[PDB]
Amino acid sequence: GSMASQDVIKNLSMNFAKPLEDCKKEMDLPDSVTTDFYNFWKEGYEFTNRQTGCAILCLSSKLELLDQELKLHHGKAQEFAKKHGADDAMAKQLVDLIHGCAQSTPDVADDPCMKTLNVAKCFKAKIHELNWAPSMEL
Ligand SMILES: CCCCCC/C=C\CCCCCCCC=O
């Protein structure tokens, strides 16, 4: 049921967010990214700025979910999801949701941080629509 699917997202999210303090230190990210992560799954919450996108790219990179062009590694993102409780079907759906979101998000400004932040917003909305958003912070 919806709560068990939210717990997979919850598990994925906490694991994804673990090295955030290291990404903050390494890239001199501002304290607002920690707030944005705390509120990541809050309905209606609007992200501060592109630095939250920089934080998402760093976390992805640390989990080696990015390829050389700072784009999602589909196979590695799938396996990440499965190691944190997703079945093959759910893992594939999540990768499809991110990919769709990347495709419907043009990077006109050559700004991966902004683009990643817009991909994240698109992804968060899709998860909310599936009622797969947990009520717990990162
Ligand atoms: C559970 C926490 C998930 C937070 C949102 C992560 C979304 C995208 C990661 C960034 C990768 C896609 C952005 C680059 C476009 C190409 O692929």
Would residue 136 count as lying in a domain? no
Torsion of CA 19, 26, 123, 107, to 10 degrees: -160
- Residue located nearest, by CA, to atom 14 of ligand 1: 71
Domain harbouring 76, CATH code: 1.10.238.20
Least Cα distance to 1 among 136, 132, 124 occurs for: 132
Contacts of 133 (CB under 8 A, 6+ apart): 6, 9, 41, 43, 124, 127
In whole angstroms, what separates CA 66 from the centre of its chain?
12
For residue 132, give the 3-state DSSP assignment.
Answer: coil
Would residue 116 count as lying in a domain? yes
Instruction: Give the residue carrying structure tokens 């050389």.
Output: 68
Would residue 95 count as lying in a domain? yes
Residue 34: CA count within 13 A, CB half-sphere: 10
How many domains are there within the chain? Answer: 1
Residues near ligand 1 (Cβ within 6 A): 12-13, 16, 56, 60, 71-72, 98, 102, 116, 119-120, 123
Q: Tokens standing for 22?
A: 């290291």
Q: Which method was it determined by? A: X-ray
Distance CA 56, CA 85 (A): 21
Distance CA 76, CA 55 (A): 19
- Residue located nearest, by CA, to atom 10 of ligand 1: 116
Instruction: Give the residue carrying structure tokens 């304290």.
Output: 31
For residue 131, give the 3-state DSSP assignment.
Answer: coil
Q: How far is the CA of 3 from the centre of ligand 1 (A)?
A: 23
Would residue 137 count as lying in a domain? no
Instruction: Give the residue carrying structure tokens 């607002």.
Output: 32
The residue range of the domain holding 69 is 2-130
The resolution in Å comes to: 2.1
